[PDB]
Design a protein around this ligand. Structure first.
Ligand SMILES: C[C@H](O)COCC(COC[C@@H](C)O)(COC[C@@H](C)O)COC[C@@H](C)O
Ligand SMILES: Nc1nc(=O)[nH]c2nc[nH]c12
Ligand SMILES: [Zn+2]
Ligand SMILES: [Zn+2]
Length: 422
């Protein structure tokens, strides 16, 4: 067994620390007088940083790893992604889905991610991918806690039987209800689709997560309905609005009006930098807008926002290794969160704020919580973000589920020298 972690730094804390493990929980965290000797049963942090595991609050595991089949997203738009997907969605099998989802899931474990929320397209009479993904959830449970969103990719009112299909998906056991109002045929459909979604969530006691205004249209304002419904139902914390990239193009007077409500409703926001930068601004020429939602202003106002990866190697996004520090990296740049303080706090955007978004209770390095945690070979958030460090150890329920032996770089000058980039 493991009974202690030694020589660990904690975010915003002086010196080193020792973390006591008992029965898959954290029993105690005590300061150190300094470096301790490596004992058996203890895991050596080696003065690395200890934080709770990375969260991925937005990913599509049913589409993952399918890039270039049958065809490519030539235009690289959010709308042609959906055309390409519908072609490939016709060739989905139970085995195919599980095979691909497991691959990405493995990368995620390797990268210190122990919590994941995956959207699954339920605009399909057969519900192949949703049913397969409900199994993957149970299969992967020992390493990752997977939440499944029933995601009506082709609309609730705009797809034949979409409302029925969404409901069946909840009956079967999807944890979260999704919607996509800006894709519905009309504005009125969009608005009503959100009443339905909310009624479903209340009927089944489930969370909500909308693809909300993912479009460079300053008239796409469905987020206000999401926030208003949540507030009316008192269900704030259970509600997430994903993307809201339209907000990047709102006029400032409306945005300021809107923010009052967003703060009162207590809903959550996910931005997806890697994908947003790639797919937004595609209808601009020059100049060309960035297209990420208003992260910086949300942080200032204390509105919970976090970062997802959204797509790993599929029609919508041809790259990725499910790496959250890489996502955070693109986010700080594009959102211009480049002060020292801002970059160092950036970890919260892939840890604590994401956990708040998934509505987790058992989360954080504190006594009484499960021994779920990761160790980074780095001094602080800034250092880890700057050097794009891998995850040294991933500990789940008191057991090491993954470990990375760091790369080693040598330059041969007048004599050999180790390079660490510090
Ligand atoms: C995609 C690849 O890298 C992994 O595939 C093996 C895997 C086998 O099924 C697991 C289940 C508990 O019986 C999962 O492997 C993880 C183990 C080592 O815990 C998933 O393969 C999908 C098939 C069954 O269509
Ligand atoms: N960015 C995306 N937008 C969508 O509407 N559907 C998707 N499915 C995977 N990625 C995406
Ligand atoms: Zn099966
Ligand atoms: Zn998505």
């Amino acid at each position: 067994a493991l009974q202690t972690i030694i020589n660990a730094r904690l975010p915003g804390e002086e010196g080193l620390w020792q973390i006591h493990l008992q029965d898959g929980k954290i029993s105690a965290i005590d300061a150190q007088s300094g470096v301790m000797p490596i004992t058996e049963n203890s895991l050596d942090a080696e003065q690395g940083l200890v934080i709770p595991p990375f969260v991925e609050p937005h990913i599509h595991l049913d589409t993952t790893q399918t890039a270039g089949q049958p065809n490519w997203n030539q235009s690289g738009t959010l709308f042609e992604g959906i055309e390409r997907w519908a072609e490939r969605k016709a060739l989905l099998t139970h085995d195919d889905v599980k095979q691909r989802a497991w691959q990405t899931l493995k990368w995620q474990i390797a990268n210190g991610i122990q919590h994941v929320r995956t959207h699954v397209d339920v605009s399909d009479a057969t519900l192949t991918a949703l049913k397969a993904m409900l199994e993957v959830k149970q299969e992967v449970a020992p390493w990752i806690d997977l939440q499944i969103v029933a995601f009506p990719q082709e609309g609730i009112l705009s797809y034949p039987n979409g409302e029925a299909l969404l409901e069946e998906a909840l009956r079967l056991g999807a944890d979260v209800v999704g919607a996509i109002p800006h894709f519905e045929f009309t504005r009125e459909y969009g608005v009503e689709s959100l009443h339905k979604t909310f009624a479903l969530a209340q009927k089944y006691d489930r969370l909500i997560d909308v693809h909300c205004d993912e479009i460079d249209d300053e008239q796409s304002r469905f987020v206000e309905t999401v926030a208003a419904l949540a507030h009316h139902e008192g269900m704030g914390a259970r509600v997430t609005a994903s993307h809201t990239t339209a907000m990047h193009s709102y006029n400032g007077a409306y945005t300021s009006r809107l923010f009052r409500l967003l703060k009162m409703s207590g809903i959550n926001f996910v931005a997806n930098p890697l994908v947003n930068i790639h797919l937004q601004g595609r209808f601009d020429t020059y100049p060309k807008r960035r297209g990420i939602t208003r992260v910086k202003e949300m942080l200032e106002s204390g509105i919970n926002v976090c970062f997802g990866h959204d797509d790993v190697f599929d029609p919508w996004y041809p790259l990725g290794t499910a790496n959250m520090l890489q996502v955070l990296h693109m986010g700080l740049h594009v959102c211009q969160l480049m002060g020292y303080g801002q970059i160092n706090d950036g970890l919260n955007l892939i840890t604590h704020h994401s956990a708040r978004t998934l509505n987790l209770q058992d989360y954080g390095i504190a006594a009484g919580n499960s021994a779920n945690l990761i160790i980074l070979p780095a001094e602080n958030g800034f250092d880890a973000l700057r050097r794009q460090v891998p995850v040294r150890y991933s500990v789940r329920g008191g057991k090491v589920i993954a470990s990375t032996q760091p790369a080693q770089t040598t330059v041969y000058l007048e004599q050999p020298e180790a390079i660490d980039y510090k």
